[PDB]
Amino acid sequence: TSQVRQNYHQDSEAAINRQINLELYASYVYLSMSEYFDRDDVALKNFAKYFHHQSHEEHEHAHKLMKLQEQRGGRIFLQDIQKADEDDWESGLNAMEAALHLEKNVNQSLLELHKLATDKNDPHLADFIETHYLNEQVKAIKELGDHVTNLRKMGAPESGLAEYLFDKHTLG
Amino acid sequence: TSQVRQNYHQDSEAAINRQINLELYASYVYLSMSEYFDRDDVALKNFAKYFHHQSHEEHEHAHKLMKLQEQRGGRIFLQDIQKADEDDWESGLNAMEAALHLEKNVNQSLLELHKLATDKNDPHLADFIETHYLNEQVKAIKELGDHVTNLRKMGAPESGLAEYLFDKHTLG
Amino acid sequence: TSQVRQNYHQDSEAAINRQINLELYASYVYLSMSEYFDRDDVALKNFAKYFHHQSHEEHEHAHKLMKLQEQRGGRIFLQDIQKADEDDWESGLNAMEAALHLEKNVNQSLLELHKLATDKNDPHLADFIETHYLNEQVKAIKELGDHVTNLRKMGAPESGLAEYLFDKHTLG
Amino acid sequence: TSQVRQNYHQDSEAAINRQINLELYASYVYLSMSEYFDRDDVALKNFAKYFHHQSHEEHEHAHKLMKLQEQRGGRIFLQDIQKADEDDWESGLNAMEAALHLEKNVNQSLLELHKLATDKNDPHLADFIETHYLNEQVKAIKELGDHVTNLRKMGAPESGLAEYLFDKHTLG
Amino acid sequence: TSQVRQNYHQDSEAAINRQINLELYASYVYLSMSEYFDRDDVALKNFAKYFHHQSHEEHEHAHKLMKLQEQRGGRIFLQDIQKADEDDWESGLNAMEAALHLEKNVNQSLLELHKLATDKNDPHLADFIETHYLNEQVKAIKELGDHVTNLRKMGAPESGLAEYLFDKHTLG
Amino acid sequence: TSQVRQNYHQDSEAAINRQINLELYASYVYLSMSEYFDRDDVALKNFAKYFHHQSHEEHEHAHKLMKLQEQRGGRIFLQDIQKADEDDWESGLNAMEAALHLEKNVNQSLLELHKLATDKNDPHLADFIETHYLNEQVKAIKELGDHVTNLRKMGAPESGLAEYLFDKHTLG
Ligand SMILES: [Ca+2]
Ligand SMILES: [Ca+2]
Ligand SMILES: [Ca+2]
Ligand SMILES: [Ca+2]
Ligand SMILES: [Ca+2]
Ligand SMILES: [Ca+2]
Ligand SMILES: [Ca+2]
Ligand SMILES: [Ca+2]
Ligand SMILES: [Cu+2]
Ligand SMILES: [Cu+2]
Ligand SMILES: [Cu+2]
Ligand SMILES: [Cu+2]
Ligand SMILES: [Cu+2]
Ligand SMILES: [Cu+2]
Ligand SMILES: [Cu+2]
Ligand SMILES: [Cu+2]
Ligand SMILES: [Cu+2]
Ligand SMILES: [Cu+2]
Ligand SMILES: [Cu+2]
Ligand SMILES: [Cu+2]
Ligand SMILES: [Cu+2]
Ligand SMILES: [Cu+2]
Ligand SMILES: [Cu+2]
């Protein structure tokens, strides 16, 4: 056992390891989306930039969790980063919809992680999740909802003009 | 024979002369396209600027080849610069499509030039083509593909609004 | 007929198209001369620079004419740009002499163009030629005459020292 | 088939997809190593920083390959990013030794990729690998060899003082 | 065998060692030429400066090759640096002619080195030679050809005035 | 005989030519040492930098002697630059010891050169050696002695840690 370990339950350590992998997965989904919009038959450069930014943000989320694990005296156990469900994201609107779904899934996992911290009387972990994760998720979900809404109201995905103009005026 | 000539095959010298003319031709096609978009009944100023830029880029491509010829001790033999297949380029989308076709044709000629350099064991010429031409073509082809894609998805060439908005937001 | 076309005779439109091609031809002659002086067995770098500058100047002359055509509602009809009469320009003095001859030929064509504008009662075209072309030609012809004179008096083309020193002290 | 695709063999497209995954794997190995050195019972912060830098470098290597795929008109097919062979890297010297082995493995794959490009007469791909990958690998391998050598000569991994001083004076 | 050595043939290692010596030899020839022009009975200071610069350039060429040897895990085996064929270089024109001959000889050796790299399927070495050596040689050969040409046309070596003026206007 | 030659004995001219070669030899020994420390199985970068600096310093020493020869009206006769006694310098301490021996040998030759100048009543040469060479040698010998001493006292060459720390704290 670590010289630093204090009030850190085995279940919490395990849950943190699972959360690290999920953040790395989210980052990979975003990378997949990013590259999709750089295809010659898609060619929406600001969508590509947006999802590239989101990919690196999720990477930072993974970093903080790995830091938390080391600080608390837990042991990081990395797992395979699974590829995304799709190779072809269909459209700007579909990718945004898929991103929204992903972020709500990550949020659900974080809420379960928080409940575990509360149940194990780990207020440091509870606050770590609150401070660095919970509001970030809520903000991310709201932004993606905003994007989905505009794209829909503009006539996406049927209107390619809608996705082009959104790429230019919101994302660029 | 030149005091500088070394490992420079007669066939390579001839192929370089042919490539010079093709680069000058490409430059002329782009000039034709440029001026078309400045017509009072077309009036797409950023299309005009874009193709003007492409015209001068091809001119630089011709310059480097002429320099290569002199450096290697070959003799430049210039040929007539043929006018383009069209006077009237129809639309923004059509010009982009025609440009894409042109760039792929120039690329094919460069690949054949590279094979000749390899076959004649001329690694200087091989690398000259690799370094200054091959990736430039690949980048140019991809960009034109991107442009064609956006214009199509926006509703060009039927939608004049599409070509107007593309001129403003991508090319301007 | 153009929505902009006013007082613009079919003969003038045709003559402008012919003048565009001649300016492009002059530019090409200068390019040929430029590259000649970059040959390892010629090696007069400031001659090369001088004629390169002249090449791009003629290009600008072609640009203004193409602009005039579009502004007046004429239609640009481009033609093949013919290669120069020579591949080998012999010497600094010979190239200058050939350039002088070329500029006087271009000037003759411009004077005929001006007479046509006067005959067709087209004062806009008449002034366009006067303002942008006629004095430019007179200046160019005089400069080339000056250069020919100095080279001759210095002992060119027999004296290679003369051409070397002229390259350094006048053109450099 | 892509509007941009030219001279791009199905085997090359597949090999590029495999190389993308390998670069992502290398990045993940480095991340694993990075976090290991941040453990309270390891605590070599400059080792951690060094491998973190290497992780992001491999990420850039993956980015350029993904860009190449899109530019050439290939389709990116992402795969699971496999976790590293180890959770516990034992020591500074062992991690450096493992990194050296990894880089030589990546290099072998790049050399095979280059042979395939040569065999398929794809000089653009050949030069892309040469320009952006081959010398980068050679430099990386040499640096890791240098590091392994110093650590060994200093008395690692038996001497914890050696690894501490190396962390401070070479990596910091 | 080196911990870093990969895909590096014994013949390539040997050829690199031979090339290192040749670059050091070229540097020494240039040094000899440099000092010759500083003789009180020669006194062409800009010739001296020019060849001094060339001497140090060849030294850098030797440095990069030595670096390549270490990076690839080869062992540097230095050899005697042979003195030049002449003590007395006769004239500005003769030295330039001798330099031209030297550079073409070095170039021939580099081309043979490149063929060996290709034959041994060593694309890293092939590109190293292409990137850092082949175009540098072509540029150097062309420049020396240019210099020889001007000196000849000016009346060298019979005309001491020609060599004096060339020293002042081209080299100074 | 030179128009500038005055009070310059044939023996002095010969001795200066021999000294030039010895300075070039010393420079080459240092270059050999420099590259040795850049080996992947040695990897002492500041040793490499130190000896590289010493190599170029000896080159300057050779330059001043060549200048002296020309100024006095002597004729430079260059000789082959002999490779060093070793390819493998064993260690930091051994190289420093070998450098110390080399510098004392060069110093002995300079002292003999000075005696010859005194014997031939050549006070210009005597002072040239005094001013530019004698104290430089004494300083160089003392510095190398200092380095040898520290390395020995630190536990070199048996202690690789000693050579590593010396590389970092004295040479870096
Ligand atoms: Ca899977
Ligand atoms: Ca025709
Ligand atoms: Ca013709
Ligand atoms: Ca697995
Ligand atoms: Ca290459
Ligand atoms: Ca000899
Ligand atoms: Ca020997
Ligand atoms: Ca004194
Ligand atoms: Cu990224
Ligand atoms: Cu996240
Ligand atoms: Cu233009
Ligand atoms: Cu081009
Ligand atoms: Cu807008
Ligand atoms: Cu130009
Ligand atoms: Cu003109
Ligand atoms: Cu990171
Ligand atoms: Cu990589
Ligand atoms: Cu210290
Ligand atoms: Cu020097
Ligand atoms: Cu060289
Ligand atoms: Cu002068
Ligand atoms: Cu050096
Ligand atoms: Cu010395």
Structural commentary:
The structure is cut from a larger assembly and holds six copies of chain A (172 residues). With 172 residues, chain A is mainly alpha-helical. Chain A has five helices and no strands. Chain A has one domain: Up-down Bundle (Ferritin), CATH 1.20.1260. Chain A has helices at 10-36, 45-72, 92-119, 123-154, 160-169. Helices cover 73% and strands 0% of the residues of chain A. In chain A, 46% of the residues are buried. Chains in contact: A-B, A-D, B-C, B-D, B-E, C-E, D-E, D-F, E-F. The interface between A and D is medium-sized, with 28 and 28 residues. Residues 82-83 of chain C line the site of one calcium ion. Chains A, B, C, D, E, F: It comes from Homo sapiens (Human). Chains A, B, C, D, E, F: It is found in: Cytoplasm; Lysosome; Cytoplasmic vesicle, Autophagosome. Chains A, B, C, D, E, F: Its EC number is 1.16.3.1. Chains A, B, C, D, E, F: It is an enzyme of class 1 (oxidoreductase). Chains A, B, C, D, E, F: The record marks 18 as: Essential for association with cargo receptor NCOA4.
Features:
172 residues; part of a larger assembly; binds copper (II) ion; elongated; binds calcium ion; Ferritin; mainly alpha; 6 chains; 5 helices
First and last CA, distance of chain A: 50 Å
The count of domains of chain A is 1
Strand content of chain A: under 5%
Tally of separate helices of chain A: 5
Helix content of chain A: over 70%
Oligomer state equals part of a larger assembly
Largest interface pair: A-D, 28 and 28 residues
Subcellular location (chains A, B, C, D, E, F): Cytoplasm; Lysosome; Cytoplasmic vesicle, Autophagosome
GO biological process, one term (chains A, B, C, D, E, F): negative regulation of fibroblast proliferation
Binding site for Fe cation 1 (chains A, B, C, D, E, F): 23, 58, 61
Enzyme class (chains A, B, C, D, E, F): oxidoreductase
